[PDB]
């Protein structure tokens, strides 16, 4: 599984022959987040009543931020066409629960990512960047079934939620690399595992309401990204 | 709007007729023609500038400090990048006099 | 009471701790000087 | 286009100034000028509206397999913020 | 053109003091304020204890926010230097609000957009009534 | 006693042994007795002898315990032998019906 | 309503004869929340105990963890004595009568204007 | 030797100084943190089957009260 | 004063072959230069030292 | 009629228009009392830093050259954040004007140069980490280096220096003797290495290293 | 009457037996120094088969805990900006603009070429001479723990340390101020 990891880190900001144990730590972090994602979706399915993963569950969990909503709409519109039923399902899900914002369809994050990607191609590096595209959870599926689905006793994904978790894992890696670069920025003014460790620590401590002067508002399952 | 005056910086009647169209609709939403409005204050004729100055002065109050803020924070000089726009600032600071 | 604590037999953390310490990144010519002398 | 000064005029507060002002008096503030006591009311509105919108999402996915608020729509919405409420329904 | 004219009493700290209330009258206004905003969210009926739980949480949230501001105000009164240019900017950071400039986006996307959307449904249903009848 | 522990244990989902609820009930009594003692210090020292809701909340706040939210100050929650709270009231008429900001508090 | 009478008796045993009808229900809710939380703590310990039934030792550990963090008490009779011992060597400043109650030096007082704002 | 206290400060904020009396307090904070963790870990060690081992897996279950998660294997 | 001991336990128990004259030499350089108002009560102190 | 005709003459002549602005802005500034000047002073700083003024960088007659010159004869001081002056006097031909106002500013605020006669062992107040009048002197030193005025730049470092070898090495290099200056720099580098290990980073000398 | 009132249970009675530092060394505990402390404290509890992964987890837990303490302290003295929620990354200069300026509002709404953007952040708000704060004294850390109270949830650790923090509070009095004045009037 490390060979797939080595290829995808080239498309990120930690390219030019990074270490291999760092990708192992990333794999462990991604595996824990995906297990937590499976665990967190269990209560929603139990609360709903159905014994199978509904297609609206994956978008109901990720209902907090709208910037990540836009990226999911982009991935289900253009890259998910080369489809017809999923476009109407998303519209039905959008109209199922929306008041002002979700009934709609510059983010300063993806634009930075594409600007950074264009910067890496200025250094044949352009040929290497092109061949690294579409190499994340797309060539094989039998091994990805073994990495996940430990028990799979009560609720299982049928055809579609298998790919959604793969895209979320890819977005988790992209956000994890983005947080690593943010920590590396404080250093100047190959990435050491101390950078990712600090990013996890900063991402764990939230600034949620009713926090000060009390040590009873404890923590729960952090997130799924 | 910006695709007419870029290639002929030499017309005297075509530009005047076009600006006669620009300031006529202003007197009568279509409130996004900022490059078209600001380009008519400098092109070829004082009379065109005077006509555009009338709708540019009657749209505000005869105050000193309010016009001082306008030329710094409110108004953007992105339209004319190769012109000495302080000449227009002299008009605003002298139009509030007796 | 504070400065006596740094003078009353505290050299173990001053002349033994601080030896063979990597130079700060602000001074990057001392390493070049050492390499030229060694080579 | 327009600075925040008159945008502060555009807001229509719901909590009266006699509630937010009393809160400042408890903590030791005068609460005698109109301008500072509008963000606390807006911040209070945002805190409750987010919970209200979250409760609306739970209520509209109750048993679809008029709108009445119960504990089933309150204890999961308060769980993310750290509020743990558990009230017995009998005796 | 709308720019802040510095000719008024609102731009400064000059203002009429707020009338002092008691504990009994403050809770009733809290109940009224909470009831109106929940109905604006899209609700039509609710229980009494659920309202009481929400008011107490809001009361505790307001107390913690107001108390946190007080420790911020008196801490800078002895130093003279401020980490953030505004005391009100600071207290949002420990609470969770990004900035005061995020309030306009929240208001626009939860009041104006909701009202504009809510009106269109009424207009659409009015046409349906005219078409059916 | 011990029967009350078993009843709410059943609502939790699993029953409890008869040799465990006795210690659990003793622990509950100790905590409530200590909570009343903590609330007494705030009570008999300012100037009063009457129990209030806020005094119990303050004791929980200073003991690193979550404050109970949901109970007001007026006398309510009757018992007719059973804790029904199905008072379906509309918020439309409760918005602007009768209001007055007069405090009338002078020294 | 058997809990109402004993709770009033508990308050009566502490020298309180006047109360409000809402505090009694609050303590009942507090008791319900306390046991419900500690039973859940027993469940996670029992689930981590790879045992089907729930043992009694897990409750003892669970209540031990609850008292460790969720309850506050000062250190009695031993730690405060050390504080007085380590501060017993601190002397006392001399009394210099000039006008009586002098004040701490300038800067270390709540009299300082904001640097940014000016005239 | 390596990473005494100053490099950890640079790990967060490049320009920050600590007073001489503050450094010892932080070490005592770490000293108390070490003892609290190992005592609780040993208590869980004696709880598995009256004693089994110091286990990294049960340490993960212990860190729920600290609201922290180790990036380790688990 | 019955057995006063403040720095007795923390006495400078070091070899220090070359400390007295360099230290006492610093005393005359600082206490006899640029000081006249606070020097009259401390000038006699250098004699018994 | 005179005002309208005077405006027309300002349109045809650029020199007349820019001279009128320089002679009018201070005169209109005096009319305003101490009520709107503070608001305008804090609002004009972003305008000087706005991103729409980079188009006329190549134009020798610039609308920003005489704009900043107009707000220099006003008797009420105006906050400027003189760190911007380093960037303004780099692209809009404001080299000597920015330096002159820097010398007008950083000489009457503290009435004392940063020399640190003693170490941080006798002072019990601990004012601040960064000494006052430090960023402004660094910007002033950068302007002198860009202008290649080594005689003026050398004098600045001879007063703000802390070590006795940094200024000595500069003085040697000022009149030949490059080998001796190079040895003096090396004697300064290892001397700081001896002191740097015993203490913290001591952020008092950033650009000396 | 008075006999019905209970008495608090003394926690001092229940103690552990004792049959048989990393504080003055100015060091963070390394892998070798912690090994001796684990084995000596596990003999009392009766543990065998000393592993290695547990030692590393404890060391990293200490490293994260100390980072949280310093992050909490600095955050009460310096400014920062939030990215997509709770993430603190800047911990630096005054790139945050003043929200009462319309130029900042349009700049907020908007979000060779790199240097001008840095100017838009580093020069659109602040004072001419930004004075830095004094180093962290015993007062700043004392107030930091009062407000947050989240860094140390255990009462056995937070309590015993906070009174030691109180005993370390110090500031110069009037008498020392003249000595600073006398010294300042001597070098001039």
| Backbone torsions φ then ψ of J119, nearest 5 degrees | -85, 180
The DSSP 8-state label assigned to residue B2 in this structure reads: -
Q: What is the CA radius of gyration of chain E?
A: 21
Q: Give the CA count within 13 Å in the CB-facing half-sphere of J122.
A: 12
D81 lies within 8 A of chain A by CB? yes
Domain that holds residue G103: 1-119
Please tell me the total number of residues recorded for chain A in this structure: 225
- Tell me the CATH number at F7: 1.10.20.10
- Checking chain J for breaks where C and the next N are over 2.5 Å apart, the residues before them are none
Residue D83, token pair as written in the block: 């509020």
Number of neighbouring beta carbons within 10 Å of residue J43 = 19
Interface test with C, best of I10, I16, I19, I23 (most C CBs within 10 A): I10
CA–CA separation, B92 and B94 (whole Å): 5
Domain that holds residue F28: 2-62
The DSSP 8-state label assigned to residue D38 in this structure reads: T
Q: Is the dihedral of CA B55, B58, B64, B70 positive or negative?
A: negative
Q: Min CA distance, D5 vs chain K (Å)?
A: 8
H61 lies within 8 A of chain G by CB? yes
Enumerate long-range contacts of J16-25, CB under 8 Å, 24 or more apart. Answer: J17/B84, J17/B86, J17/B87, J17/B90, J18/B84, J18/B86, J18/J61, J18/J66, J20/B90, J21/B86, J21/B89, J21/B90, J21/J66, J21/J67, J21/J70, J22/J66, J22/J69, J22/J70, J24/B90, J24/B93, J24/J70, J25/J70, J25/J71, J25/J74
Three-state SS at F54: helix
The DSSP 8-state label assigned to residue A10 in this structure reads: G
Residue K46, token pair as written in the block: 């009766």
Q: Do J21 and B81 touch (CB under 8 A)?
A: no
Please tell me the total number of residues recorded for chain C in this structure: 39
Residues of G in contact with F50 (CB under 8 A): 18-20
Q: What is the DSSP string of J14-42?
A: HHHHHHHHHHHHHHHHHHS-TTTHHHHHH
| Backbone torsions φ then ψ of F89, nearest 5 degrees | -110, 150
The DSSP 8-state label assigned to residue D28 in this structure reads: T
Q: Do J55 and B91 touch (CB under 8 A)?
A: no
CA–CA separation, H15 and K96 (whole Å): 18
Q: Do K124 and J135 touch (CB under 8 A)?
A: no
Nearest residue to E107 (alpha-carbon basis) of J68, A98, D42, G44: D42
Please answer whether residues G35 and F5 qualify as being in contact, where contact means their C-beta atoms are separated by less than 8 angstroms: yes
Q: Is the dihedral of CA G3, G9, G15, G17 positive or negative?
A: positive
Touching I (3+ Cβ pairs <8 A), the chains are C, K
> The tokens 């006899």 sit on which residue?
I32
Chains D and I touch (3+ CB pairs under 8 A): no
Give the chain E residue nearest D24 (alpha carbons): E66
Q: Do E86 and K99 touch (CB under 8 A)?
A: yes
CA–CA separation, G84 and G105 (whole Å): 26
CB within 8 A of K11, min separation 6: which ones?
A: G73, G76
Give the chain K residue nearest H45 (alpha carbons): K47
Q: Min CA distance, A64 vs chain D (Å)?
A: 10
| Backbone torsions φ then ψ of K22, nearest 5 degrees | 55, 40
CB within 8 A of K36, min separation 6: which ones?
A: none
Chains F and B touch (3+ CB pairs under 8 A): no
CA–CA separation, A167 and A137 (whole Å): 8
Structural domains of chain G, count: 1
Q: What is the DSSP string of K70-107?
A: HHHHHHTTS---EETTTEE---SSS-SPPTT-HHHHHH
Q: Do E38 and F71 touch (CB under 8 A)?
A: no
| Backbone torsions φ then ψ of K82, nearest 5 degrees | -105, 130
Q: Which helix (H) or strand (E) holds J98?
A: helix J95-105
CA–CA separation, J24 and B90 (whole Å): 9
Nearest residue to A194 (alpha-carbon basis) of H10, H60, H6, H1: H10
The DSSP 8-state label assigned to residue A72 in this structure reads: H
CA–CA separation, B36 and A34 (whole Å): 55
CB within 8 A of A202, min separation 6: which ones?
A: A179, A183, K71, K87, K88, K89
Q: Which helix (H) or strand (E) holds A123?
A: none
Residues of H in contact with A32 (CB under 8 A): 74
Residue K184, token pair as written in the block: 């300042």
CB within 8 A of K117, min separation 6: which ones?
A: none
CA–CA separation, K28 and K59 (whole Å): 9
Can you list the alpha helix ranges (DSSP code H) found in chain A?
2-8, 21-48, 57-61, 67-77, 84-96, 110-121, 125-131, 142-147, 161-188, 193-204
Q: Give the CA count within 13 Å in the CB-facing half-sphere of K123.
A: 23
Region for residue J148 given its phi and psi (left: phi exceeds 0; alpha: psi -120 to 50; beta: otherwise): left
Q: Do H15 and J200 touch (CB under 8 A)?
A: no
Q: What is the CA radius of gyration of chain B?
A: 14
Method by which this entry was solved: cryo-EM
Residues within 8 A of K (CB atoms), H 44-63 only: 45-46, 51, 53-56, 59, 63
Residue F61, token pair as written in the block: 């706040």
Touching D (3+ Cβ pairs <8 A), the chains are A, E, F, G, K
CB within 8 A of J204, min separation 6: which ones?
A: J116, J130, J131, J162
User: Measured at the alpha carbon of residue E109, what is the angle toward residues E105 and E111, in degrees to the nearest 5?
Assistant: 110
CA–CA separation, E2 and D73 (whole Å): 44
Residue I5, token pair as written in the block: 């001991």
Measured in angstroms, the resolution is: 3.7
Chains C and J touch (3+ CB pairs under 8 A): yes
Residue E97, token pair as written in the block: 């609000």
Q: Min CA distance, G13 vs chain K (Å)?
A: 6
> The tokens 């950068």 sit on which residue?
J142
Please answer whether residues H16 and H9 qualify as being in contact, where contact means their C-beta atoms are separated by less than 8 angstroms: yes
Residues within 8 A of D (CB atoms), G 46-105 only: none
Q: Do F64 and K8 touch (CB under 8 A)?
A: no
B97 lies within 8 A of chain J by CB? yes
Enumerate long-range contacts of D22-26, CB under 8 Å, 24 or more apart. Answer: D22/E18, D22/E20, D22/E21, D22/E26, D23/E62, D23/E63, D23/E66, D24/E66, D25/E20, D26/E63, D26/E66
């Amino acid at each position: 599984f490390a060979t797939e990891l080595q290829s995808m880190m080239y498309s990120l900001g930690d390219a030019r022959r990074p270490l291999h144990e760092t990708a192992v730590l990333v794999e462990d972090v991604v595996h824990t987040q995906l297990i937590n994602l499976l665990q967190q979706a269990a209560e929603v399915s139990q609360l709903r009543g159905a014994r199978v993963i509904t297609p609206e569950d994956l978008l109901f969990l990720m209902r907090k931020d709208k910037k990540k909503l836009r990226r999911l709409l982009k991935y289900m519109f253009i890259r998910d066409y080369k489809i017809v039923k999923g476009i109407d399902e998303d519209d039905l899900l959008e109209d199922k629960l929306s008041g002002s914002n979700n009934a709609n369809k510059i983010d300063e994050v993806k634009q930075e990512r594409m600007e950074r990607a264009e910067r890496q191609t200025r250094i044949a590096q352009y040929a290497e960047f092109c061949e690294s595209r579409q190499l994340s959870f797309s060539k094989k599926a039998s091994k990805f079934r073994d990495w996940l689905d430990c028990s799979s006793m009560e609720i299982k994904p049928n055809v579609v939620a298998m790919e959604i978790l793969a895209y979320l894992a890819y977005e988790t890696v992209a956000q994890l690399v983005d947080l690593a670069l943010l920590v590396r920025q404080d250093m100047v003014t190959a990435i050491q595992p101390c950078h990712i460790r600090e990013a996890i620590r900063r991402y764990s401590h939230r600034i949620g309401p009713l926090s000060p002067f009390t040590n009873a508002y404890r923590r729960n399952g952090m997130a799924f990204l | 709007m910006t695709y007419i005056e870029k290639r002929f910086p030499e017309d005297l009647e075509l530009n005047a007729q076009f600006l006669d169209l620009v300031n006529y609709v202003y007197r009568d939403l279509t409130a996004k023609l900022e490059p078209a409005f600001l380009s008519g204050l400098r092109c070829a004729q004082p009379l065109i500038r005077a006509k555009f100055f009338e709708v540019f002065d009657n749209s505000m109050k005869r105050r000193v400090y309010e016009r001082l803020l306008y030329v710094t924070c409110s108004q953007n000089w992105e339209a004319m990048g190769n012109h000495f726009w302080i000449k227009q600032c002299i008009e605003l600071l002298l139009a509030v006099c007796e | 009471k504070r400065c006596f604590k740094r003078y009353s037999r505290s050299s173990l953390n001053r002349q033994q701790d601080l030896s063979h310490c990597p130079p700060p990144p602000q001074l990057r010519l001392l390493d070049f000087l050492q390499k030229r002398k060694e080579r | 286009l327009v600075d925040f000064l008159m945008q502060l005029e555009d807001y229509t507060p719901t909590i009266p100034d006699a509630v937010t002002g009393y809160y400042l008096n408890r903590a030791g503030f005068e609460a005698s000028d109109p301008r500072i006591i509008r963000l606390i009311s807006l911040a209070a509105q945002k805190f409750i509206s987010d919970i209200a919108n979250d409760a609306l999402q739970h209520c509209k996915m109750k048993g679809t397999a008029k709108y009445t608020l119960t504990m089933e729509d309150l204890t999961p919405a308060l769980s993310e913020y750290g509020i743990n409420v558990k009230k017995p329904h009998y005796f | 053109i709308r720019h802040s004219d510095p000719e008024s009493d609102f731009y400064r700290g000059k203002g009429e003091p707020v009338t002092e209330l008691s504990w009994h009258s403050c809770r009733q206004l809290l109940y009224q304020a909470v009831a109106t905003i929940l109905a604006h969210a899209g609700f039509d009926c609710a229980n009494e204890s659920v309202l009481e739980t929400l008011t107490d949480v809001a009361h505790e949230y307001c107390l913690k926010f107001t108390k946190l501001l007080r420790f911020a105000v008196d801490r800078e009164a002895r130093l003279g230097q401020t980490p953030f240019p505004d005391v009100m900017e600071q207290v949002f950071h420990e609470v969770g609000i990004g900035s005061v400039l995020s309030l306009q986006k929240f208001w626009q996307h939860r009041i104006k957009d909701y009202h504009s959307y809510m009106l269109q449904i009424s207009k659409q249903l009015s046409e349906e009534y005219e078409r059916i009848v | 006693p011990r029967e009350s522990v078993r009843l709410m244990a059943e609502s939790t989902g699993l029953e409890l042994s008869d040799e465990v609820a006795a210690l659990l009930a003793e622990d509950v009594c100790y905590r409530l007795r200590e909570a009343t003692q903590n609330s007494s210090q705030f009570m008999k020292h300012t100037k009063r002898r009457k129990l209030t809701v806020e005094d119990f909340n303050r004791a929980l706040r200073w003991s690193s315990v979550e404050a109970v939210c949901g109970y007001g100050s007026q006398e309510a929650l009757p018992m007719r032998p059973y804790f029904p709270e199905d008072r379906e009231v509309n918020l439309v008429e409760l918005a602007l019906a009768t209001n007055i900001p007069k405090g009338c508090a002078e020294t | 309503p058997k809990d109402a009478q004993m709770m009033a008796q508990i308050l009566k045993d502490m020298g309180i004869t006047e109360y409000e009808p809402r505090v009694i229900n609050q303590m009942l809710e507090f008791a319900f929340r306390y046991v419900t939380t500690i039973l859940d703590d027993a469940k996670i310990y029992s689930s981590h105990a790879k045992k089907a039934t729930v043992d009694a030792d897990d409750v003892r550990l669970a209540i031990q963890c609850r008292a460790d963090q969720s309850f506050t008490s000062p250190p009695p009779r031993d730690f405060l004595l050390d504080i007085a011992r380590q501060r017993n060597q601190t002397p006392l400043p001399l009394i210099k009568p000039y006008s009586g109650p002098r004040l701490p030096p300038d800067r270390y007082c709540l009299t300082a204007p904001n640097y940014r704002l000016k005239s | 030797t390596k990473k005494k206290l100053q490099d950890l400060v640079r790990e967060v904020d490049p320009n920050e100084q600590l007073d001489e009396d503050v450094e010892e307090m932080l070490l005592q904070i770490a000293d108390d943190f070490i003892e609290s963790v190992v005592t609780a870990a040993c208590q869980l060690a004696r709880h598995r089957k009256s004693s089994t081992l110091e286990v990294k897996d049960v340490q993960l279950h212990l860190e729920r009260q600290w609201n922290m998660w180790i990036p380790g294997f688990g | 004063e019955s057995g006063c001991a403040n720095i007795v336990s923390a006495a400078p128990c070091q070899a220090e072959p070359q400390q007295y004259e360099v230290q006492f030499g610093r005393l005359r350089n600082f206490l006899t230069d640029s000081d006249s108002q606070h020097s009259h009560e401390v000038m006699p102190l250098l004699y018994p030292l | 009629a005179l005002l309208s005709a005077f405006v027309q003459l300002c349109h045809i002549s650029t020199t007349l228009a820019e001279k009128t602005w320089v002679q009018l802005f201070p005169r209109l500034w005096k009319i305003l009392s101490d009520r709107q000047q503070h608001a305008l002073a804090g609002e004009i700083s972003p305008f000087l830093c706005s991103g729409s003024h980079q188009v006329q960088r190549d134009c020798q007659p610039s609308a920003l050259n005489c704009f900043v010159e107009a707000m220099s004869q006003c008797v009420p001081p105006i906050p400027i954040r003189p760190c911007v002056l380093k960037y303004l006097g780099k692209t809009h031909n404001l080299w000597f004007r920015s330096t002159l106002m820097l010398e007008h500013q950083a000489f009457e605020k503290g009435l004392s140069l940063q020399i640190k006669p003693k170490q941080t062992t006798e002072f019990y107040e601990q004012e601040s980490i960064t000494p006052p009048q430090q960023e402004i002197l660094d910007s002033l030193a950068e302007l002198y280096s860009l202008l290649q005025e080594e005689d003026m730049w050398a004098g600045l470092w001879q007063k703000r220096c802390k070590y006795s070898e940094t200024a000595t090495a500069i003085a040697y290099e000022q009149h030949g003797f490059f080998e001796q200056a190079q040895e003096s720099y090396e004697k300064a580098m290892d001397k700081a290495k001896k002191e740097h290990e015993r203490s913290n980073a001591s952020p008092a000398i950033f650009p000396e290293y | 009457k008075f006999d019905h009132r209970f008495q608090p249970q003394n926690p001092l009675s229940g103690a552990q037996q004792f049959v048989a530092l990393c504080s003055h060394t100015m060091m963070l505990p390394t892998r070798g120094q912690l090994e001796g402390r684990m084995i000596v404290t596990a003999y009392e509890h009766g543990l065998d088969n000393v592993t290695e992964e547990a030692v590393s987890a404890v060391v990293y837990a200490v490293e994260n805990h100390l980072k949280d303490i310093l992050t909490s302290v600095v955050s009460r003295r310096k400014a920062y900006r939030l990215r997509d929620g709770h993430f603190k990354y800047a911990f630096g200069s005054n790139v945050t603009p003043q929200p009462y300026l319309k130029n900042s509002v349009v700049a907020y709404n908007n979000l060779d070429d790199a240097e001008q953007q840095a100017a838009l952040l580093l020069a659109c708000s602040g004072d001419t001479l930004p004075a830095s704060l004094p180093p962290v004294n015993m007062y700043d850390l004392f107030e930091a723990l009062q407000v947050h109270r989240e860094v140390i949830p255990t009462h056995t650790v937070y309590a015993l340390n906070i009174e030691r923090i109180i005993t370390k509070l110090w500031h110069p009095n009037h008498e020392e101020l003249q000595q600073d004045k006398v010294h300042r009037q001597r070098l001039a």
